[PDB]
Amino acid sequence: EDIKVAVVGAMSGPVAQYGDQEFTGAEQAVADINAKGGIKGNKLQIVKYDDACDPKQAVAVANKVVNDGIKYVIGHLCSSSTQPASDIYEDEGILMITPAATAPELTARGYQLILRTTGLDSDQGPTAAKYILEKVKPQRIAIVHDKQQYGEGLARAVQDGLKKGNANVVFFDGITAGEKDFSTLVARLKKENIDFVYYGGYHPEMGQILRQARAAGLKTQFMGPEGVANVSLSNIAGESAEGLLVTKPKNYDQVPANKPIVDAIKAKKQDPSGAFVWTTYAALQSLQAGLNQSDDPAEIAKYLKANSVDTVMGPLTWDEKGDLKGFEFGVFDWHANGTATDAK
Ligand SMILES: CC(C)[C@H](N)C(=O)O
């Protein structure tokens, strides 16, 4: 008697790379759980939904999931699309574990049926600021964001921390996502002789900004959130992605204990290096731990906040809001290689 689990993320669109990572992680974890017998004999069955990381299409997905009788949702990914979906799931008694949404607002609303297998930007932001103040110490900072929930929230958090350190923030600018042309911004960085730029947003925009900055002879150092730390950034920017600083989950694919999963994934020619392969795999293991105790959303949610669950990410424990206790983002150097190393 299969147990339906909706996996929802961007499978198409501008940031389909987030979904490629999520589905790869969900697929392998379900393959592993089922291989050992699943949940007390019952196998997990993945039902795939594409919300294109679009708020309107995510609601349409939420309504279909509620309608299809599915009780557990592993997703969505982007915060502004997860928000509206989340509310429909909460009002409807459907558990929702998100492996990528980081805006604080998600777990700040009293929801009793939401959990994350990733951290909060209330931590990610501060970490970038601290690192800039203590290790980079630039002289002329500019901050750019895409006017979206995730990017602006992070951009304002970083501005905040830099001010507390009395750093020199020359300007705070918001750009429109989807635009491929940034000559104006670039010409401005050159003009203001900006030596450091924190960018709050996704890889599509970061990739264009980076290419256009190097093409104009700028050596400006850039830094972005985990949202820009992925192979699609390197695809778009080419060598211009080299040198980029990023905050992002720890390299779980490097944990020696995890090598069997890395191998199984590589054997299907899929990419196991993305952070979301692991948070999603972890989300599936949390749901497994839950389904072993009960099939009822509230019961599962209760049980998770009550226990420490061992996962590919290490032991996980959640607060009453459904956030990971003690989660920490590291700062890394990103390489055109699709590789990432500990930052100085
Ligand atoms: C990268 C993406 C999933 C981002 N963390 C967000 O909350 O939108």
Swiss-Prot record:
Gene3D superfamilies: 3.40.50.2300. InterPro entries: Leu-bd (IPR028081), Leu_Ile_Val-bd (IPR000709), Peripla_BP_I (IPR028082). Disulfide bonds join 53-78. CDD domains: PBP1_ABC_LIVBP-like. It is found in: Periplasm. GO terms for biological process: branched-chain amino acid transport; isoleucine transport; L-leucine transport; valine transport. Keywords: Amino-acid transport, Disulfide bond, Periplasm, Signal, Transport. GO terms for cellular component: ATP-binding cassette (ABC) transporter complex, substrate-binding subunit-containing; membrane; outer membrane-bounded periplasmic space. This protein is a component of the leucine, isoleucine, valine, (threonine) transport system, which is one of the two periplasmic binding protein-dependent transport systems of the high-affinity transport of the branched-chain amino acids. Belongs to the leucine-binding protein family. This is Leu/Ile/Val-binding protein. It comes from Escherichia coli (strain K12).
